[PDB]
Design a protein around this ligand. Structure first.
Ligand SMILES: Nc1ncnc2c1ncn2[C@H]1C[C@H](O)[C@@H](COP(=O)(O)O)O1
Lengths: 125, 133
């Protein structure tokens, strides 16, 4: 009932995101836990409704990948007055993640997640 | 053929142990071995002292891996190469599922800082890199 999920941070649909998702799904599957797929937006006046729609499509796509890979997945759109890396890091701590999976190209978001996470961070090319 | 977990270690510490423990669990879960690697420049830069210390760390590290219910292998790399490149090339050579590495390193004042070898490994690796604090 109480598991430690794999947290995967997704920005957009891409081949890199798929690779990140498939690695995450294999971890989750091996450990018997779900994957939590996260996308962060600033909210407040900074977030349009158009932004929420695209994020939701990306997340819906991401979770379909996880599931197709034989893992349980859940979508979490974070709209919290935060920037992505703090959101990802705070989220991972809030759900007691086993690890955070992110794509790298570092990239600004990735470097702050690497440096600030209190969890293992798994970097996928 | 298996794809091993590769884990890089420098010195014996409670931190290196956290890295080994995570690497060992990855390996357990996947039914693969852990390859413990340590890199040394060789030639004029490496003293016998460094070899002996390297070998003692590797042995200690394999033991931690084994204690955690995984198989370990010691791989001391002495190739005239800089450590990030050694680690990255080795992981490609062995077709690792992932590299596990400690991203913090002690500065000369005793304070842990973001390691530059670890940083370079994360940036250069072709394999997934699992970053442990
Ligand atoms: N806004 C937002 N929400 C969720 N996940 C994100 C966001 N921006 C980037 N990312 C993820 C996408 C990659 O997996 C990783 C690298 O971002 P990089 O910018 O290349 O460092 O961070």
């Amino acid at each position: 009932m109480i598991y430690m999920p794999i947290v995967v941070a997704v920005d957009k649909k891409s081949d890199r995101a798929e690779r990140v998702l498939r690695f995450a799904a294999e971890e989750a599957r091996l450990r018997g836990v779900p994957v939590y797929v996260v996308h962060s937006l600033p909210g407040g006046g900074r977030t349009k409704d158009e932004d929420i729609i695209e994020a939701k499509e990306t997340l819906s796509w991401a979770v379909s990948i996880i599931r197709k890979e034989g893992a349980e997945g859940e979508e979490h759109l974070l709209v919290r007055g935060k920037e992505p890396p703090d959101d990802i890091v705070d989220f991972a701590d809030e759900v007691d993640a086993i690890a955070i999976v992110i794509g790298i190209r570092f990239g600004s978001v990735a470097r702050d997640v690497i440096l600030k996470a209190n969890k293992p961070v798994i970097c996928i090319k």
